[PDB]
Design a protein around this nucleic acid. Sequence first.
DNA 1: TCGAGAATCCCGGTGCCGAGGCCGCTCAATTGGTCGTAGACAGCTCTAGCACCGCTTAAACGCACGTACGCGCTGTCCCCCGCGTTTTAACCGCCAAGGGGATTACTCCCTAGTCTCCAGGCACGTGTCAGATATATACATCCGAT
DNA 2: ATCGGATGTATATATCTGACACGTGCCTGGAGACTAGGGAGTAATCCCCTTGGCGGTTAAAACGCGGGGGACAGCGCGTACGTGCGTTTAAGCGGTGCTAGAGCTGTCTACGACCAATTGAGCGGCCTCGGCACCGGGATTCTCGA
Lengths: 107, 86, 93, 93, 408, 96
Amino acid sequence: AKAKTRSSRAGLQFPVGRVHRLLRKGNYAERVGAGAPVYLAAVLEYLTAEILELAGNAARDNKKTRIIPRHLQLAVRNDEELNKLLGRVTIAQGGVLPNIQSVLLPK
Amino acid sequence: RHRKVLRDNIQGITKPAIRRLARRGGVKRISGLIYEETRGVLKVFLENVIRDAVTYTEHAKRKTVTAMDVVYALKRQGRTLYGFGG
Amino acid sequence: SRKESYAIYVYKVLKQVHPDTGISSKAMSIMNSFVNDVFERIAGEASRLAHYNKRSTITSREIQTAVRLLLPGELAKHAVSEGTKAVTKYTSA
Amino acid sequence: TRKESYAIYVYKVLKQVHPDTGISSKAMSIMNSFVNDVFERIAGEASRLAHYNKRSTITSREIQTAVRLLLPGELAKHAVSEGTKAVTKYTSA
Amino acid sequence: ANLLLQDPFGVLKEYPEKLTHTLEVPVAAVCVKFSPRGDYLAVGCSNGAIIIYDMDSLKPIAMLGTHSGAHTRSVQSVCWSNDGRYLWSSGRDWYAKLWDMTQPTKCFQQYKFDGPLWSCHVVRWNVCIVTVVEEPTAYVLTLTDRQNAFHCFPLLEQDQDISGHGYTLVACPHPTIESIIITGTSKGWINAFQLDLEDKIRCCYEEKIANANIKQIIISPSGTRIAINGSDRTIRQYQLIVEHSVSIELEHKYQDIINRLQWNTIFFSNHSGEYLVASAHGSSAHDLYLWETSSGSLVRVLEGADEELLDIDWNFYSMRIASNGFESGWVYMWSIVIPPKWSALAPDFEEVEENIDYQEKENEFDIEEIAIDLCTPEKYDVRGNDISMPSFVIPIDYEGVIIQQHWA
Amino acid sequence: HRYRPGTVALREIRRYQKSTELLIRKLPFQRLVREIAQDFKTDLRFQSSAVMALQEASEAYLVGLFEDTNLCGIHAKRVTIMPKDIQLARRIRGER
DNA sequence: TCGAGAATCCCGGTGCCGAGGCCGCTCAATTGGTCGTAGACAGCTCTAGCACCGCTTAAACGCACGTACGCGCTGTCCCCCGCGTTTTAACCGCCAAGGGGATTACTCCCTAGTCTCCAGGCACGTGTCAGATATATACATCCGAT
DNA sequence: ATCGGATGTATATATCTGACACGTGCCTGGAGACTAGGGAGTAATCCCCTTGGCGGTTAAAACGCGGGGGACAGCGCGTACGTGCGTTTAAGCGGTGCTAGAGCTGTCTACGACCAATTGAGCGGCCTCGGCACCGGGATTCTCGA
């Protein structure tokens, strides 16, 4: 498609310039290969696309346009795969998943 | 030579072997339904470890799940195992 | 001073899937600090796989095997296939 | 060819504090594997700590501030004092 | 073919995307070849059976290997005729059986070979080029006016050496000439062989591209593109210039940069070969690939399976991909799905994908002898195929159909 | 002579807590590992000290679950563990 | 099985600021060259994993039985919820002040890199000794009967 | 309270074994000398953000009250888990065979580091406006005492 800006050679929206910088002056290994920041920028595109698909999806239910952090916890905890990926995490100012244990519900 | 699709080796984790694991945990009376539940919890623990233990070898291009790679599979899940190197 | 971020790069993925919605500046700092966390778990894990095997290179094969170690189940299989789709646009063109 | 261990350097410290007492070969391999694990906790923690302050040097000051994080409590107050004793006795001698 | 005349709005794809059947064949297979229509799938089975499947209900109609000529060892490759009448079957029991489905259990003529085989390829429905293992010529076996004289025609000139090139392992005939046979050596070199259908042959083309064991040579069905699968990790598609007189040139190279796998089988598209597929060799490669044969990019991946897929077939009528998952043995199958349409409930519905802003007209408040022909069949389908050839329908077994309630 | 319900168990506990051999047998556990590893590759070959490291890490987890099955079954005021006790101890710990 | 009650929902209008869209502008991205070296080949040796077999019996398996424990069903009482009235400190919005963080700019000294040296420590072959079975025994906890 | 066995448990020899502590050889990694060099320390400014205070306003907490229900003990049942006794059926073992794969060496080709030479996307800064806070009428509805 293009020549400059390697992301555009790959067809990503995440930079492969910045990721190839952050695999050298982060000191992860001695010599990072040339295909390695391309593969890593594609995965970080996809997981950001998977969240922001499901985030604005539950933005529509709320009926609001923009995404507040409350929509992000509703996109993460409602989805099992994302939940597993973000198991330890706490999303700041994000509420909880609305559930009651059903013993406590009335007769 | 022999294409044996192995099935129901889970019933070798016997009812008097979940009793003795119960005893080392220090529990007194076991229900009748534990024995088909612990095998459900044993087959979940072994599925998570061996899937990582194969992946470490499948990347390393071998056909042996060597004991460095089981130890690294357990270290990633936060259950380190001292006794086989690392 | 120049403190970089992934702020504009998340924005160009929000204007792909949901091309009318916006994002708050608190929920930008989550996605700026999400990408900074899945980085250190992928390059953190693929700096052991290229050390246990006595290699010295993060190739593009370890970032495949880092992703199949971390990401569970059907996010692994789709992000692996998003990877090799995007490194082959890189190698040919 | 050759596989290194911490087998002998454990063994001198066994005969230092228990001079009649032997050790097995399975329970040497635990004490070989234990030393390698306290390394990669300490040198892991003293590497991120060099990165967070944007230095590039593991000096002795980082490993004082990495022992003081991992080691819980009374082992922290000892192994700091067992360190700075031994970094004076290397420097002054 | 009238189902595709009614299925879409008018848009039909050029590759299947999803995978909707799976032949539960527990004994494993080696090769899967369809009929020249989409009806019959010949399955080259592992033990030595051939379990031929009707591709409408996923349960078989015959088994070639009951009366005479059953394969003792494995069966390697198979092709079909122009009409789908015969079967030419190459196996590892040192036997090439020409079967005929007029007698759908008995062979017609066999040949005890000197050893095992790799493949078979038919030019006419009787003559068939076979790949004898460890042989630097291709003893193409022809069924002559008598069946017995299988003339072991050595596909080599009497002077020419492929010493240093190994044996010939692949031979695939040309589609459009039908007389020049492209073969590829075990070490690098590619020959051409113009059979006179007398037995003079001309080594018009020889070359070497790269030192590998050439596992497979395919030609596109327009005779333009020719792809070569080596024993190293590359696919070289070439362009074919035959007026005889032949020379090729490099078009594209397809590799897996990530895992560096070997490509087992490769297959082309229908008309001019605008799409190249492949199946990789190593484990965790669970998916057939596609490539745009001009641009070169990985454009789509048939992500349906769970195992490694060994052989492949693309019949162009039903647009299916049959492939044996080599580990379990089951035949994975892809098909172009057609979603249902409620637009055919009444003769006027409409399925518009968006809330249309219909303009408000005035009407809302107000209160034959064409030419008729009955004789000709159809000539071209929606796919644009060679249709108006009423194919050899395989007859069902009307010798023992009454028995088939009792004991097979 | 048919000693009392319960005190064979406390004689059985003090034997097993004071001993350290492996409790699941070797050969049935080696066929469980070669059954579960068929899903992830076909014809693997386990190095025979990695069917000890999958034993002494697995029954040191099953024992560590029954120490936390017992603490919640005491909590329900009984001495009998049950499968509604196990699935609490996996859920509170975060295995679900 | 319900009409009074009240909390929630919801839909509205009016206002705020903070998301978004640009204007200039620097340093990080690109690249187009060298350069050696890491990894990718085949190749080979070998050892360790797998397959098998005969055995010996320790352990699983099944059943019978009786017993104690789970469970359920009571009644009790206590203590937690609900709510009104008074009380108080959180909050917001001021003020102001100065400490400390952040950057800049010299400066220097620690260390990375290289070489020259050599013995520490690695694997191996060694005897030997602290074990674990193999064995009778003194007595702690346990049990049926008293 | 306590008997009478009593029976496994923990306390003493025997003595064989193959695990280990030890003795020779060697080799490769560690130690020193010293070199250039850049990374950190050490000054310096400077001004941003935190600590302090206060004057309100009032949501919210603190408190006390009644009353209700949920906890907790008790009891009785019945079932199912334990105990053991008797009996199978693999596990363990050791042993031999076998070979597929692991490890290593060595060649040798691709390829990432690095340098400079150029620049253009990206961050910071600035305007701006619309998405949502924020409240009011009413309509539902959600419970509860009728």
